[PDB]
Design an enzyme around this catalytic site. Structure first.
Site, PDB file in Angstrom:
ATOM      1  N   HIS A  62      -9.703 -31.049  18.098  1.00 23.99           N
ATOM      2  CA  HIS A  62      -9.721 -30.852  16.658  1.00 23.99           C
ATOM      3  C   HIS A  62      -8.394 -30.346  16.128  1.00 23.99           C
ATOM      4  CE1 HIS A  62     -14.050 -31.273  17.014  1.00 23.99           C
ATOM      5  NE2 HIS A  62     -14.099 -30.233  17.826  1.00 23.99           N
ATOM      6  N   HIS A  92      -3.562 -21.754  15.067  1.00 23.77           N
ATOM      7  CA  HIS A  92      -3.603 -23.205  15.064  1.00 23.77           C
ATOM      8  C   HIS A  92      -3.230 -23.666  13.664  1.00 23.77           C
ATOM      9  CE1 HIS A  92      -7.518 -21.940  13.512  1.00 23.77           C
ATOM     10  NE2 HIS A  92      -7.379 -22.989  12.720  1.00 23.77           N
ATOM     11  N   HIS A  94      -3.739 -27.018  10.580  1.00 23.41           N
ATOM     12  CA  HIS A  94      -4.376 -28.194  10.021  1.00 23.41           C
ATOM     13  C   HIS A  94      -3.302 -28.959   9.289  1.00 23.41           C
ATOM     14  CE1 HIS A  94      -8.381 -26.258  10.564  1.00 23.41           C
ATOM     15  NE2 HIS A  94      -7.653 -25.166  10.379  1.00 23.41           N
ATOM     16  N   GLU A 104      -5.780 -26.836   3.887  1.00 25.37           N
ATOM     17  CA  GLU A 104      -7.193 -26.595   3.616  1.00 25.37           C
ATOM     18  C   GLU A 104      -7.338 -25.869   2.283  1.00 25.37           C
ATOM     19  OE1 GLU A 104      -8.951 -25.031   7.391  1.00 25.37           O
ATOM     20  OE2 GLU A 104      -9.570 -27.157   7.408  1.00 25.37           O
ATOM     21  N   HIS A 117      -3.182 -21.061  10.577  1.00 21.35           N
ATOM     22  CA  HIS A 117      -4.219 -20.035  10.623  1.00 21.35           C
ATOM     23  C   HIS A 117      -3.997 -19.135  11.821  1.00 21.35           C
ATOM     24  CE1 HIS A 117      -7.092 -22.731   8.152  1.00 21.35           C
ATOM     25  NE2 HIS A 117      -6.191 -22.099   7.419  1.00 21.35           N
ATOM     26  N   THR A 196     -13.556 -22.624   8.732  1.00 21.06           N
ATOM     27  CA  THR A 196     -13.430 -23.923   8.076  1.00 21.06           C
ATOM     28  C   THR A 196     -13.828 -25.091   8.959  1.00 21.06           C
ATOM     29  OG1 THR A 196     -11.138 -24.314   8.687  1.00 21.06           O
ATOM     30  CG2 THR A 196     -11.540 -23.037   6.644  1.00 21.06           C
ATOM     31  N   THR A 197     -14.294 -24.841  10.177  1.00 20.73           N
ATOM     32  CA  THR A 197     -14.889 -25.873  11.016  1.00 20.73           C
ATOM     33  C   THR A 197     -16.256 -25.375  11.437  1.00 20.73           C
ATOM     34  OG1 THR A 197     -14.218 -25.096  13.210  1.00 20.73           O
ATOM     35  CG2 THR A 197     -12.654 -26.437  11.990  1.00 20.73           C
TER      36      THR A 197
HETATM   37  N1  LIG Z   1     -10.007 -22.888  10.824  1.00 26.74           N
HETATM   38  S1  LIG Z   1     -10.521 -21.323  11.019  1.00 26.74           S
HETATM   39  O1  LIG Z   1     -11.457 -20.935   9.976  1.00 26.74           O
HETATM   40  O2  LIG Z   1      -9.360 -20.424  11.173  1.00 26.74           O
HETATM   41  C1  LIG Z   1     -11.378 -21.286  12.595  1.00 26.74           C
HETATM   42  C2  LIG Z   1     -12.409 -22.171  12.850  1.00 26.74           C
HETATM   43  C3  LIG Z   1     -13.081 -22.166  14.067  1.00 26.74           C
HETATM   44  C4  LIG Z   1     -12.727 -21.266  15.041  1.00 26.74           C
HETATM   45  C5  LIG Z   1     -13.486 -21.383  16.370  1.00 26.74           C
HETATM   46  C6  LIG Z   1     -14.171 -20.154  16.906  1.00 26.74           C
HETATM   47  N2  LIG Z   1     -14.845 -20.557  18.146  1.00 26.74           N
HETATM   48  C7  LIG Z   1     -16.095 -21.286  18.073  1.00 26.74           C
HETATM   49  C8  LIG Z   1     -17.165 -20.224  17.900  1.00 26.74           C
HETATM   50  C9  LIG Z   1     -17.492 -19.252  18.856  1.00 26.74           C
HETATM   51  C10 LIG Z   1     -18.528 -18.479  18.241  1.00 26.74           C
HETATM   52  C11 LIG Z   1     -18.707 -19.057  16.979  1.00 26.74           C
HETATM   53  O3  LIG Z   1     -17.874 -20.055  16.826  1.00 26.74           O
HETATM   54  C12 LIG Z   1     -14.256 -20.183  19.421  1.00 26.74           C
HETATM   55  O4  LIG Z   1     -13.236 -19.578  19.418  1.00 26.74           O
HETATM   56  C13 LIG Z   1     -14.940 -20.568  20.745  1.00 26.74           C
HETATM   57  N3  LIG Z   1     -14.257 -20.050  21.932  1.00 26.74           N
HETATM   58  C14 LIG Z   1     -14.367 -21.025  23.010  1.00 26.74           C
HETATM   59  C15 LIG Z   1     -13.443 -22.229  22.852  1.00 26.74           C
HETATM   60  C16 LIG Z   1     -11.974 -21.828  22.801  1.00 26.74           C
HETATM   61  O5  LIG Z   1     -11.622 -20.989  21.925  1.00 26.74           O
HETATM   62  O6  LIG Z   1     -11.131 -22.327  23.611  1.00 26.74           O
HETATM   63  C17 LIG Z   1     -14.916 -18.848  22.450  1.00 26.74           C
HETATM   64  C18 LIG Z   1     -14.919 -17.697  21.453  1.00 26.74           C
HETATM   65  C19 LIG Z   1     -15.474 -16.386  22.015  1.00 26.74           C
HETATM   66  C20 LIG Z   1     -16.841 -16.184  22.152  1.00 26.74           C
HETATM   67  C21 LIG Z   1     -17.320 -14.980  22.649  1.00 26.74           C
HETATM   68  C22 LIG Z   1     -16.442 -13.968  23.006  1.00 26.74           C
HETATM   69  C23 LIG Z   1     -15.081 -14.178  22.873  1.00 26.74           C
HETATM   70  C24 LIG Z   1     -14.596 -15.382  22.385  1.00 26.74           C
HETATM   71  C25 LIG Z   1     -11.682 -20.374  14.801  1.00 26.74           C
HETATM   72  C26 LIG Z   1     -11.015 -20.365  13.575  1.00 26.74           C
HETATM   73 ZN   LIG Z   2      -8.128 -23.225  10.840  1.00 24.87          ZN
END
Ligand SMILES: NS(=O)(=O)c1ccc(CCN(Cc2ccco2)C(=O)CN(CCC(=O)O)CCc2ccccc2)cc1
Ligand SMILES: [Zn+2]
Ligand SMILES: NS(=O)(=O)c1ccc(CCN(Cc2ccco2)C(=O)CN(CCC(=O)O)CCc2ccccc2)cc1
Length: 258
Positions: A62, A92, A94, A104, A117, A196-197
């Site tokens: 993504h 990251h 967009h 965004e 972001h 935002t995702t």
């Molecule tokens: N565009 S935005 O708004 O800035 C924005 C949009 C989406 C995200 C994604 C957040 N997510 C998905 C998510 C997880 C929970 C809800 O949603 C993760 O980070 C998932 N991650 C694994 C994949 C990876 O990170 O490699 C693990 C995160 C984690 C869980 C538990 C303890 C510590 C860390 C971040 C910023």
């Molecule tokens: Zn973002």
């Protein structure tokens, strides 16, 4: 999860698996500069990235994330609208297929070429997964990118992208200083919003800087050579990975500056 940015799985479809997509505090939003009110009670941001420890860069299908060691208070965001301490976990971007779109958030309906972001989580909740379940769990610092002169501090990111072209690829990315991605001014707008995702959780205090950074056409062209697909699959260029502005509803955007 089969959500994406294509016609068949893009933002207009997300609500079917993530009904909060139609919620009361969704992001991004258009920032109407004439309606945002200066809030003299807001404090200056405190961006404390001197001790940041970057680790790895990942193409997740993504976007690409530059990940940090968030097991200690090394790179933190405080102040501004925030109570307490928020640890940097990743950044990251967009971006668009052309320079006239990609961000965004928008400013008086203007779209920038891209948006950075810097994602932080509130240490009072112990881990990121707990933080995203709270209305004040995350603070995302958003920075607009416009195309003009190169951003020197972005080049190390740009030059590693060839090595993470496809979804699931990662590379070492130690010793990167995210302070090189900031503009001069920390003037900002702030409002309560969401990821935002998907899963679109309503857990973010948004802090969007007024001053964009300039990147070169060559730099953003390299973003656009990444792939949404995995290795050995037909090429789908990673472009237009942005969600459009969502209804502001019962929210006020506050400005740190007059
Ligand atoms: N565009 S935005 O708004 O800035 C924005 C949009 C989406 C995200 C994604 C957040 N997510 C998905 C998510 C997880 C929970 C809800 O949603 C993760 O980070 C998932 N991650 C694994 C994949 C990876 O990170 O490699 C693990 C995160 C984690 C869980 C538990 C303890 C510590 C860390 C971040 C910023
Ligand atoms: Zn973002
Ligand atoms: N969460 S959501 O937004 O509400 C959301 C969730 C799902 C879909 C449908 C996805 N669609 C339409 C589409 C989207 C893009 C193109 O076609 C598929 O066709 C399914 N298929 C490709 C989906 C994908 O991985 O892209 C994967 C399933 C599959 C089965 C057997 C073998 C291989 C793969 C749309 C939105």
């Amino acid at each position: 999860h089969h959500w994406g940015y294509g016609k068949h799985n893009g933002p207009e479809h997300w609500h079917k698996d993530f009904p909060i997509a139609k919620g009361e505090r969704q992001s991004p939003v258009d920032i109407d500069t004439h309606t945002a009110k200066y809030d003299p009670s807001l404090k200056p941001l405190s961006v404390s990235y001197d001790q940041a420890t970057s680790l790895r860069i990942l193409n997740n299908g993504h976007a690409f994330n530059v990940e940090f060691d968030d097991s200690q208070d090394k790179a933190v965001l405080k102040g501004g609208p925030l109570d307490g301490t928020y640890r940097l976990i990743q950044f990251h971007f967009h971006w668009g297929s052309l320079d006239g779109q990609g961000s965004e958030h928008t400013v008086d309906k203007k779209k920038y070429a891209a948006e950075l972001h810097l994602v932080h989580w509130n240490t009072k909740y112990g881990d990121f997964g707990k933080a995203v379940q709270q209305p004040d769990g995350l603070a995302v610092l958003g920075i607009f990118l416009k195309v003009g002169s190169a951003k020197p501090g972005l080049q190390k990111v740009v030059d590693v992208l060839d090595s993470i072209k496809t979804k699931g690829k990662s590379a070492d990315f130690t010793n990167f200083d995210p302070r090189g991605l900031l503009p001069e001014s920390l003037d900002y707008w702030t409002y309560p919003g969401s990821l935002t995702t998907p899963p679109l959780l309503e857990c973010v205090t948004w802090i969007v800087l007024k001053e964009p950074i300039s990147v070169s056409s060559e730099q953003v062209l390299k973003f656009r050579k990444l792939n949404f697909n995995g290795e050995g699959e037909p090429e789908e260029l990673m472009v237009d990975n942005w969600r459009p502005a969502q209804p502001l509803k019962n929210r006020q955007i506050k400005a740190s500056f007059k």
